[PDB]
C-alpha cells in the first residue's frame, strides 16, 4: 500500500534521527572528557565523519527506495507522501550536518 510505504519510511527516518540524536548525546560526553591531543582530534573527527556518513547513507536509501516503491505502485496523496519523505530526508541531512559542525567545535 502507498500509505503503508509512507508510514514505514517515516518510521525508519525517525529511527535514524533518534540514532543521530543518541550519537550526539554520547559524543558530547566523549569529547568533553577526553585528552584532546593532536592525534585524538584528528582521529575523532574522522570517526564522527565516518559515523554520520553511515547515517546519511541510511536515510538516503530509505528516501530513494520509498520514492521508487511509490512510482511502481502508481502503475497499478501519493505525491504528498513523496514530498513529506523528501522533506524528512532533507531535514535529517541538515541535522546530520549540524552535529558534524558542533563536533568540530567541541574538538577544537
Amino acid at each position, epitope marked *: 500500500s502507498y500509505q503503508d510505504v509512507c508510514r514505514k519510511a517515516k518510521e525508519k527516518l525517525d*529511527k535514524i534521527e533518534m540514532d543521530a540524536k543518541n550519537y550526539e548525546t554520547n559524543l558530547k560526553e566523549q569529547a568533553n572528557n577526553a585528552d584532546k591531543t593532536e592525534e585524538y582530534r584528528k582521529k575523532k573527527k574522522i570517526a564522527i565523519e565516518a559515523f554520520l556518513k553511515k*547515517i546519511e547513507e541510511a536515510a538516503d536509501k530509505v528516501a530513494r527506495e520509498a520514492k521508487q516503491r511509490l512510482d511502481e505502485l502508481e502503475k497499478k496523496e501519493l505525491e504528498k507522501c513523496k514530498e513529506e519523505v523528501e522533506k524528512r530526508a532533507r531535514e535529517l541531512r541538515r541535522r546530520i550536518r549540524e552535529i558534524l559542525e558542533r563536533a568540530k567545535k567541541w574538538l577544537d
Partner: single-chain antibody
Amino acid sequence: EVQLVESGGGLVQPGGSLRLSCAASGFTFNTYWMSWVRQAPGKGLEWVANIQQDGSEKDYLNSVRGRFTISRDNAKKSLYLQMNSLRAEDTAVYYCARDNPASAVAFDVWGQGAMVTVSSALTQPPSVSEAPRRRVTIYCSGSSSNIGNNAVSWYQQLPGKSPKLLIYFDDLVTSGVSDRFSGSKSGTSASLAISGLQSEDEADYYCAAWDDRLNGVVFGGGTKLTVL
C-alpha cells in the same frame, strides 16, 4: 555506568510460562531500541526480539511468534520478555541488549544473561588459527536479503562471557575496540580481519544482519579463533 541486568531465570516445564526482566541504568533508556538475544548451552547466538523506544514497533524471531512478547516500562527502565508455550528449543541463556544504532541493528551493550531451562542463513568457517602478531580473516556468507541489503555487525564472545560488539554498519569499529579489528562487505559476503593477533583474541566470533525475507536478525554459526 551503562549496564543491563537480567533477572527472572529459572526451570520451567514444557508448555509453561516464564517472565524475564532486565533493569537498565547509566543511559536514557527511553531513547533506545532494546532487544533480547539467546544462546542455547554450547551453541551459537540466536536473536529473539527488538522493541522500539515507546513500544510502537516490535520485531520477533519467527519461531517465537505467537509465544513470546517483548515489552518495556520506561518509568522503571525495564525491558521484559514474557515467554509462553515454552519448548525444549527455548532452553538458553537470554541476554538483554541495547540496539544502537537501531538503523544498523547492532547490539552495543549486553547484560550477563539469565538462564532459562525448559525441562544457518549466514555461513561462517567453524575455525580459524594463526600465531601471535599475525592476521586471520573470517568470512560470513549470506544472500541478497541479509548481507546484500543490510548492515553487518560482528561480535566477539570470550569463554564464559557475554558477547561484545566489535564492528557495526559493515565496517565501523566500536569506540574502545582496537583498530586491528576491521570489517568489510562486498556483495553478499562480509569479512572480519584481525591483525596483530594476541592470545586474548582467542574467542568465538559471530556475524549478524537483518534479513528482509525472514523479517528478523540472522546470526552466523560462529567461528572459533585459536592463537598458536
